[PDB]
Amino acid sequence: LRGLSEDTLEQLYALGFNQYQAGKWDDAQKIFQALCMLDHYDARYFLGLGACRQSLGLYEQALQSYSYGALMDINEPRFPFHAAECHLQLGDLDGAESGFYSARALAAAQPAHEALAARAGAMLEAVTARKD
């Protein structure tokens, strides 16, 4: 399947996205996994991969995906934000704090990410409160 055009990749992306929307997480994971192998530079594939793993409760695996994603798009707040959610479920408050903090910064610099900026701020405060 190596070397598909951007149109197919785009439609394969749509299928994974839709299966994720449908709660069909294991199927969706498999597609994003495939997309991540086909184009190792497109951050959205790693966002998808991460997301499916999160929903399945595979937090560490989700993190691996989100981390690579963040290197691909240094400005994307969704990566540190959901990374932080995974850290939280795993009982890692420093990771969580560090991700919500970074997500706030990235999100605050981008009007498109306003709602996230506040969720990030709110999660950061909850994490800080838990830490004491």
């Binding site: 785009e10 439609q11 996205f17 959205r44 966002l47 998808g48 999160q54 969704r78 959901h82």
Partner: peptide, 9 residues
């Protein structure tokens, strides 16, 4: 809440 993925084009 899940993750809000970017919609396909």
């Amino acid at each position: 809440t899940g993750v809000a993925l970017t919609p396909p084009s």
